[PDB]
Amino acid sequence: RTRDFKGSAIRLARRLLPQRALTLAVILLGVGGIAIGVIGPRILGHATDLLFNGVIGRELPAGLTKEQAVEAARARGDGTFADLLSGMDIVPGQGVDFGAVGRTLALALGLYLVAALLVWVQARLLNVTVQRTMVALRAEVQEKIHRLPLSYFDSRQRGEVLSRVTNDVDNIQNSVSMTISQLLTSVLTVFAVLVMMLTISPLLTLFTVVTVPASLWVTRWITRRSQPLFVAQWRNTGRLAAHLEETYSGFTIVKTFGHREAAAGKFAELNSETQQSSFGAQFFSGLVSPATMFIGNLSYVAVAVVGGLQVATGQITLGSIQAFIQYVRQFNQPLTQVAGMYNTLQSGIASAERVFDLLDTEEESADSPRRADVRTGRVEFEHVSFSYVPGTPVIEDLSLVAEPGSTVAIVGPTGAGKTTLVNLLMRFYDVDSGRITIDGVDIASVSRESLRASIGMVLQDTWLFAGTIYDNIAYGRPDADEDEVIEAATAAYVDRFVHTLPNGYDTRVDDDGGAISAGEKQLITIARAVLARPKLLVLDEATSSVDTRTELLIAHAMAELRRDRTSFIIAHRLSTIRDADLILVMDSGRIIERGTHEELLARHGRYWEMTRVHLGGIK
């Protein structure tokens, strides 16, 4: 839940502030439009006063005094009637004076036009401001994402940052744009209608303001009652989603073995349960508006009857009551929305505080534009003891030396630290103790844009964006020619399978119908790495899902045939690694031994042991 309200709201208002006079003008136009929209019905009530005065003065005998007319009415009885006559400006026998009514209505119509124009202009300006600030926020979030160190993405949960960066800004939009318009107009409207009501009469004003405690209490009570049903619906929909995930993801297994009907029955039971829960929750959620409308309508009964009886006493005129009734309706109208928009406002405030906490996260140290270059690929390590967190030494006393023509291989069990090794070589994380140098150049004093753009690196998993396979391969080097992409592709044997797809090199790899399994995913990623024309290739177990024949063909063609560049190879299959230039055996975060295939065959140790796992699997 939310942890900071005042600070988050203050900084959101500050984010909308920098236009200064523009925001001030927006608020001023809103205040204006509200004020004129409140004054209007008072002028209409004055016109109704004139009409009522004329119609009730035409009845009395002409030429009499108003006090004389009241006395004459009282002499025959009708005390309430005479008290009424005493309550407005009238002269017996006078007409309705259509000229005064006409000019009053002309003033009212002009004011209504002015108020409509002001409200429209205010809404336009506020929309422009909200979209401008939202573009600014999106740009700031993008710059942040491209400036965060990888430690945040590593430490943060899998499904948290995506909703923090994508859904939260949408909540920011649907919060700021809705509230800063509607809540502000509603608060100004209720306050202006309240002060106008107090100007008219306070005794009725009390009867129109007693609703707010009652309406707020009713809304809070209905929320309290709805919370158990809401959580029940949430849990039932969660169970339904879990069962649907089980059925859809493992569709082959459920389709086979004849368990289709059992899954259908389980879904039917879960669907009935979630139907019941959703019915209850939605009923109690929608119950709020009729209740608050009922409270306001009861207030309407109260104000109508009290105004009628008090006019019968002559304490006020009829037009004031007509305006007062219109104010009562205009007072209730925003209350229902204001009661329910508190949840949206606080959701937006929580999303804003989360996004600003993300934007306040410390950034990785600035680059040093040394503009390093590679000529021999002499990658050397010395006394590296990097660890993710103060604690276990994930990397310990690591040291190695490469060769310009070497395709050196790092092999070990899962969780040894090869991925963190290549990550450190990518400067994704800092190194505590020891130093990393390539071609005699310390990469710690080298800008990352100059470094990573020349190495070339592939993860075990594959990242493919919502583009065609052609764009996916061309991402390695967009400046590459059209046929250079096809050459790099056929170098990685993706062309061996791509033509079997419905649309060769044009398939939406995000929308693909599952025809691209993990091995061909890795083939596509390898092709993308090839197209970048790297000179310091490393392969973090992109070796996994592909077959060994295609493995060895690719490895040869783009690491051993390309003698001008050194390479790093990581693979769990020792076959794919055999006969490579220098082999590094590493365990427990440190290199156990190093040498060539014949050397670690000659001396029996760890490497001989995993060679005795697959073929000579003496268990």
Binding site: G37, V101, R138, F279, R496, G514, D547
Partner: protein
């Protein structure tokens, strides 16, 4: 635009009689809400200007009764509308799930489970929300307007023409605004989806985004998407900002004209003052209902694209179908025959599998090996008919697989796919999928055969050790072994292994295979493999490259005659 209505007018049909009752309840509640100003006119008319406070209090009691009726009818309307919307959502979810159940593997892969789940639950909920909102909130404005015209006719219809001309102009203005706004809203929703896709893609592979130092391209793409979304949202905001002021101005100008014409009628003596108050309150109620209803009109485009996405699923007929005249043998042995079969996706330049002609004897272990992407992954699905043969024929025991009863075939086929998966619950629950009635002794025998007993026995819960919803809590090798054991307790005529042995340790694979031939040598075993060590022991070996058969025979003959298998073996050997 039209798909949503083509879905509602189909899947709300069972609830027509309930929508009728919610409509009449809403009508009565709105009519009482507009009747309150009518009796207000009465009390100001013959209570005021006459000095009768008894009439004042009597009409006050009448108004209290009217508002009580209004609240009871509104509460009933909300209740029945919530029931109708929830039932519609339930029916739509059931129908969508039932239609998805009949899908083959081809269309399921075409849609994707990660999107099919949301398309079957959240994109049904989005339409349910719109149905409930339009039942309980949106139809208030048209009902308010019609009731206002009716009450104007009831209350001195001599001026009711003012309302009769005012309401149509308000409706025309709002309809024009809605018509010019809705396509902009749909485009804005699509662009929001696009920018969310861009952000998700950037976040998923930030490591590889920085690996290629392609930050400027990502910044340019995000800036372009954000700017076009901003332009669409600005147009939508323009149309929405030119929306409330128009309605407010129309209502206020109509009210001013109402005051003028009411004064004119009062001068002639064919009008009374209270009717002016009643008419003004009618206008205020109409404005309130119109604002409260057309505020929510952002929901409609989202539900429209949502219903289009659901209709994508609901309009896709399954390619796989029972022949409706199925061959019904008493049992089918382990004789698999493939004759010149080919398989290709529509529009593909080259087939993914072609010219396969291998066959297996009654009981035999046959292993098919090939390079990645060379159609090997589809042969297993073709045998058990996940997909269907485009050209050629595949037959089981001499009768075509497309003519055999598919359910009987699956009952006789023990398959473990490369898409390894498990269901929630205990290991006994997942293992129960094999037979659903086997005793625990048979399950233990299965784990012994699958080499999974060695680790599952150490758990205190034994067969009842809980598993993850997606099987994540187990390792890949353990997942494969559990799927193997699930296959073992079926006693099927043909075993279908879809590279399940690839992820296992070689010694574990050897012990699993020797145990399997110890228990079920008579049953035919078909293995697609990526590793040679699981192929040498097979009686018959067939190799496919580039989607076509390149070799067949025994292992040693494959070395002697097949250069491609020779390369495979020399690359696999240590």
């Amino acid at each position: 635009s039209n798909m949503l209505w083509a879905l509602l007018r189909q899947y709300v049909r069972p609830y027509r009689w309930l929508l009728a009752v919610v409509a009449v309840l809403q009508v009565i509640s709105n009519m009482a809400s507009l009747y309150l100003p009518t009796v207000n006119a009465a009390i100001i008319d013959d209570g005021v200007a006459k000095g009768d406070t008894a009439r004042i209090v009597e009409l006050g009691a009448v108004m209290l009764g009217v508002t009580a009726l209004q609240v009871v009818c509104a509460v009933g309307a909300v209740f029945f509308g919530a029931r109708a919307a929830t039932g519609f959502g339930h029916d739509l979810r059931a129908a969508v799930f039932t239609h998805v159940t009949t899908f083959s593997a081809e269309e399921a892969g075409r849609f994707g489970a990660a999107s099919l789940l949301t398309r079957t639950t959240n994109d049904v909920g989005h339409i349910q929300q719109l149905v409930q909102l339009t039942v309980t909130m949106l139809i208030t404005a048209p009902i308010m307007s019609i009731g206002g015209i009716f009450m104007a006719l009831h209350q001195d219809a001599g001026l009711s023409w003012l309302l009769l001309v005012s309401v149509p102009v308000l409706g025309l203005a709002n309809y024009w605004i809605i018509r010019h706004l809705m396509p902009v809203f749909t485009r804005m929703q699509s662009l929001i989806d696009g920018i969310n896709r861009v952000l998700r893609d950037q976040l998923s592979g930030i490591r590889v985004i920085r690996a290629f130092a392609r930050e400027p391209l990502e910044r340019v793409r995000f800036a372009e998407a954000n700017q076009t979304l901003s332009d669409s949202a600005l147009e939508a905001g323009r149309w929405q900002a030119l929306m409330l002021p128009v309605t407010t101005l129309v209502i206020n100008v109509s009210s001013v004209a109402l005051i003028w014409f009411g004064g004119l009628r009062i001068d002639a003596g064919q009008m009374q003052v209270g009717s002016l108050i009643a008419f003004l309150a009618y206008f205020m109620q109409i404005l309130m209902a119109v604002l409260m209803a057309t505020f929510m009109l952002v929901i409609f485009p989202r539900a429209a694209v949502c219903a289009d996405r659901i209709g994508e699923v609901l309009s896709t007929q399954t390619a796989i179908t029972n022949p409706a005249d199925p061959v019904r043998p008493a049992a089918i042995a382990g004789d698999i025959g493939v004759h010149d079969a080919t398989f290709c996706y529509p529009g593909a330049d080259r087939p993914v599998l072609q010219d396969v002609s291998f066959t297996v004897p009654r009981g035999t272990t046959t292993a098919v090996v090939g390079s990645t992407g060379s159609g090997k992954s589809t042969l297993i699905s073709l045998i058990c008919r996940l997909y269907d043969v485009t050209s050629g024929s595949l037959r089981i025991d001499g009768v075509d697989v497309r003519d055999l009863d598919i359910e009987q075939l699956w009952s006789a086929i023990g398959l473990v796919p490369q898409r390894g998966y498990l269901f929630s619950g205990t290991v006994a629950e997942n293992l129960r999928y094999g037979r659903a009635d086997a005793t625990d002794d048979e399950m233990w025998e299965a784990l012994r055969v699958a080499a999974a007993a060695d680790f599952v026995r150490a758990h205190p819960q034994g067969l009842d050790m809980p598993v993850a919803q997606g099987g994540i809590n187990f390792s890949g090798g353990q997942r494969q072994r559990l799927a193997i054991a699930r296959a073992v307790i079926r006693r099927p005529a043909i075993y279908l292994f879809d590279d399940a042995f690839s992820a296992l340790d070689v010694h574990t694979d050897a012990r699993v295979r020797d145990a399997l031939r110890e228990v079920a040598a008579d049953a035919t075993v078909v293995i697609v493999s990526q590793r040679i060590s699981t192929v040498i022991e097979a009686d018959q070996v067939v190799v496919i490259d580039d989607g076509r058969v390149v070799g067949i025979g025994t292992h040693d003959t494959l070395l002697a005659d097949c250069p491609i298998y020779a390369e495979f073996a020399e690359s696999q050997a240590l």
